[PDB]
Coordinates of C-alpha atoms in Angstrom, one line a residue:
Chain P
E1 CA 56.6 24.4 50.0
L2 CA 56.3 21.1 48.1
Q3 CA 54.2 22.0 45.1
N4 CA 56.4 24.7 44.1
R5 CA 59.4 22.4 44.4
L6 CA 57.8 19.8 42.3
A7 CA 56.8 22.4 39.7
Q8 CA 60.4 23.4 39.2
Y9 CA 61.7 19.9 39.0
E10 CA 59.0 19.3 36.4
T11 CA 60.3 22.0 34.1
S12 CA 64.1 21.7 34.6
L13 CA 66.8 19.5 33.4
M14 CA 68.8 17.8 36.2
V15 CA 72.5 17.7 35.7
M16 CA 74.8 15.3 37.4
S17 CA 78.6 15.5 37.6
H18 CA 79.9 12.0 37.3
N19 CA 82.6 9.8 35.6
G20 CA 81.9 6.2 35.2
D21 CA 78.9 4.0 34.6
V22 CA 75.6 5.8 34.9
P23 CA 73.2 5.1 37.8
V24 CA 69.7 4.0 37.8
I25 CA 67.4 6.6 39.3
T26 CA 63.8 5.9 40.1
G27 CA 61.4 7.6 37.8
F28 CA 64.1 9.3 35.8
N29 CA 65.6 8.8 32.4
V30 CA 69.3 8.8 32.9
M31 CA 71.9 9.4 30.3
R32 CA 75.5 10.4 29.7
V33 CA 75.8 13.3 27.4
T34 CA 78.3 15.8 26.1
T35 CA 76.1 18.1 24.0
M36 CA 72.9 20.0 24.5
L37 CA 71.1 18.2 21.7
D38 CA 71.7 15.0 23.5
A39 CA 70.7 16.6 26.8
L40 CA 67.7 18.3 25.3
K41 CA 66.9 14.8 23.9
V42 CA 66.5 12.8 27.1
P43 CA 62.1 13.6 33.7
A44 CA 65.7 13.3 33.0
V45 CA 69.1 13.3 34.5
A46 CA 71.9 14.3 32.1
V47 CA 75.2 12.9 33.3
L48 CA 78.3 14.9 32.7
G49 CA 81.8 13.7 33.1
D50 CA 85.2 15.0 32.0
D51 CA 84.3 14.5 28.4
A52 CA 81.6 17.1 28.7
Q53 CA 84.0 19.9 29.5
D54 CA 82.4 22.3 27.0
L55 CA 78.8 21.6 27.8
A56 CA 79.5 21.9 31.5
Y57 CA 81.1 25.3 30.9
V58 CA 78.0 26.4 29.0
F59 CA 75.6 25.4 31.8
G60 CA 77.8 27.1 34.3
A61 CA 78.8 30.2 32.5
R62 CA 76.2 30.8 29.8
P63 CA 72.9 29.7 31.4
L64 CA 70.8 32.0 29.2
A65 CA 71.9 30.2 26.1
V66 CA 70.4 26.9 27.2
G67 CA 66.7 27.6 27.2
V68 CA 65.8 25.4 30.1
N69 CA 66.4 25.6 33.8
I70 CA 69.3 23.5 35.0
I71 CA 69.5 21.9 38.4
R72 CA 72.8 20.6 39.6
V73 CA 72.3 17.4 41.6
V74 CA 74.4 15.7 44.1
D75 CA 74.2 12.9 46.6
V76 CA 73.2 10.4 44.0
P77 CA 74.2 7.0 45.3
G78 CA 77.4 5.9 43.7
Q79 CA 78.1 9.3 42.3
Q80 CA 81.8 9.9 41.4
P81 CA 82.0 13.6 40.6
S82 CA 84.2 15.0 37.9
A83 CA 86.3 17.8 39.4
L84 CA 86.3 19.6 36.0
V85 CA 82.5 19.5 35.7
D86 CA 82.1 20.5 39.3
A87 CA 84.3 23.5 38.8
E88 CA 82.6 24.4 35.6
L89 CA 79.2 24.3 37.3
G90 CA 80.3 26.1 40.4
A91 CA 77.8 28.9 40.1
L92 CA 75.0 26.4 40.3
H93 CA 73.6 25.5 43.7
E94 CA 74.0 21.8 44.5
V95 CA 70.7 20.1 45.1
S96 CA 70.4 16.8 46.8
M97 CA 68.9 14.1 44.6
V98 CA 67.7 12.4 47.8
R99 CA 65.5 15.4 48.6
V100 CA 64.2 15.5 45.0
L101 CA 63.3 11.8 45.1
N102 CA 61.7 12.2 48.5
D103 CA 59.4 15.0 47.3
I104 CA 58.3 13.1 44.2
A105 CA 57.7 9.9 46.1
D106 CA 55.8 11.8 48.9
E107 CA 53.6 13.5 46.3
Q108 CA 52.8 10.2 44.8
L109 CA 51.5 8.9 48.1
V110 CA 49.2 11.9 48.2
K111 CA 48.0 11.1 44.7
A112 CA 47.5 7.5 45.4
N113 CA 45.5 8.4 48.5
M114 CA 42.9 10.4 46.7
Chain D
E1 CA 81.0 18.7 -5.5
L2 CA 77.2 19.3 -5.0
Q3 CA 76.1 16.2 -3.3
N4 CA 78.5 16.5 -0.6
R5 CA 77.5 20.2 -0.2
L6 CA 73.8 19.3 0.1
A7 CA 74.5 16.5 2.5
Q8 CA 76.1 18.9 4.9
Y9 CA 73.4 21.5 4.6
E10 CA 70.9 18.7 5.3
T11 CA 72.4 17.9 8.7
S12 CA 73.4 21.4 9.9
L13 CA 71.8 24.3 11.5
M14 CA 72.2 27.6 9.6
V15 CA 72.8 30.5 11.7
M16 CA 72.2 34.1 10.7
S17 CA 73.5 37.3 12.3
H18 CA 70.7 39.8 12.1
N19 CA 68.8 42.5 14.1
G20 CA 65.4 43.4 12.9
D21 CA 62.5 41.6 11.3
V22 CA 63.2 38.1 10.1
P23 CA 63.4 37.3 6.4
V24 CA 61.5 34.8 4.4
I25 CA 63.8 32.3 2.9
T26 CA 62.6 29.8 0.3
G27 CA 62.4 26.3 1.6
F28 CA 63.6 27.2 5.1
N29 CA 61.9 27.6 8.4
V30 CA 63.2 30.9 9.7
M31 CA 63.1 32.0 13.3
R32 CA 64.6 34.4 15.7
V33 CA 66.1 32.6 18.8
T34 CA 68.3 33.3 21.8
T35 CA 68.6 29.8 23.2
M36 CA 69.6 26.4 21.9
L37 CA 66.3 24.8 22.8
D38 CA 64.6 27.2 20.6
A39 CA 67.3 26.7 17.9
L40 CA 67.2 23.0 18.3
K41 CA 63.4 23.4 17.9
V42 CA 63.1 25.0 14.5
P43 CA 65.7 22.9 7.2
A44 CA 66.1 25.9 9.4
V45 CA 67.7 29.2 9.7
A46 CA 68.1 30.4 13.3
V47 CA 68.3 34.2 13.5
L48 CA 70.6 35.7 16.1
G49 CA 70.7 39.4 17.0
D50 CA 72.1 41.3 19.9
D51 CA 69.8 39.7 22.3
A52 CA 71.4 36.3 21.6
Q53 CA 74.8 37.3 22.9
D54 CA 75.2 34.2 25.0
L55 CA 74.1 31.7 22.4
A56 CA 76.3 33.3 19.8
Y57 CA 79.2 33.0 22.1
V58 CA 78.5 29.3 22.6
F59 CA 78.3 28.6 18.8
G60 CA 81.5 30.5 18.3
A61 CA 83.6 29.4 21.2
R62 CA 82.1 26.1 22.4
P63 CA 81.1 24.3 19.2
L64 CA 81.4 20.9 20.7
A65 CA 78.7 21.6 23.3
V66 CA 76.1 22.1 20.7
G67 CA 75.7 18.7 19.2
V68 CA 74.9 19.8 15.7
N69 CA 77.0 21.4 12.9
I70 CA 76.6 25.1 12.6
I71 CA 76.9 27.0 9.4
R72 CA 77.1 30.7 9.5
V73 CA 75.3 32.4 6.7
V74 CA 75.6 35.7 5.0
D75 CA 74.3 37.5 2.0
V76 CA 70.7 37.0 2.9
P77 CA 68.7 39.7 1.2
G78 CA 67.9 42.4 3.7
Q79 CA 70.3 41.0 6.3
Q80 CA 71.3 43.6 9.0
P81 CA 74.2 41.9 10.9
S82 CA 74.7 42.3 14.6
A83 CA 78.3 43.3 15.2
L84 CA 78.2 41.5 18.5
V85 CA 77.0 38.2 17.0
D86 CA 79.4 38.5 14.1
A87 CA 82.3 38.9 16.5
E88 CA 81.1 36.1 18.7
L89 CA 80.9 33.8 15.6
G90 CA 84.2 34.9 14.2
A91 CA 85.7 31.5 14.1
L92 CA 83.0 30.3 11.8
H93 CA 83.5 30.6 8.1
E94 CA 80.9 32.8 6.4
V95 CA 78.8 30.9 3.8
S96 CA 76.7 32.7 1.3
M97 CA 73.1 31.9 1.5
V98 CA 72.7 32.6 -2.2
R99 CA 75.1 29.7 -2.9
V100 CA 73.2 27.5 -0.6
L101 CA 69.8 28.3 -2.2
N102 CA 71.3 27.9 -5.6
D103 CA 72.5 24.4 -4.8
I104 CA 69.2 23.3 -3.4
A105 CA 67.2 24.8 -6.3
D106 CA 69.6 23.2 -8.9
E107 CA 69.3 19.8 -7.3
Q108 CA 65.6 20.1 -7.3
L109 CA 65.7 20.6 -11.1
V110 CA 67.6 17.4 -11.3
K111 CA 65.1 15.6 -9.2
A112 CA 62.2 17.0 -11.2
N113 CA 63.9 15.9 -14.4
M114 CA 64.0 12.2 -13.5

């Protein structure tokens, strides 16, 4: 249900496979990174491209070393996925950014209506 | 020479292989961790034991994903190394904590003498 969805967005780091200029995403700090300190530094969307080969590997193969839940996002308008990152993150379930944004926007209407 | 040594201590995270209660180390925040967020959270000595199998692996095999220099320390009084962590961090050169402390203490005498 929605509350639980938002609760998990709230405490996770979104991760986006993408090479090229970074997108603007409503309500999210967006930032290209290649290390966890930079990721742990940025609601945020950490953008990973080919140059983040090692970090992608860690997120995909050594999840418990991170210390924060990672959510792999797709369907970001303009997204140009890195095949390397996608492969590295294969064990992570792709979540649509559109659905994420929808939920947050919808909950905001609720909040504005109180 | 000493200044360069201290400069690198200053900007690195010390990592200690050890199972058991954590030590007290003069001038250092000491803390057992198993994830990078907790490590990146702690001058600090991050203590890794068997339960930090994945994080140790990352430090030892995917250094570039970390975002901060890691210095593997040994000769900490009372240290009881984890064979797993030691193996995982094998590519990291063991540095004696005694030498590290010596340097910092010696530089402090200099500073106190000005």
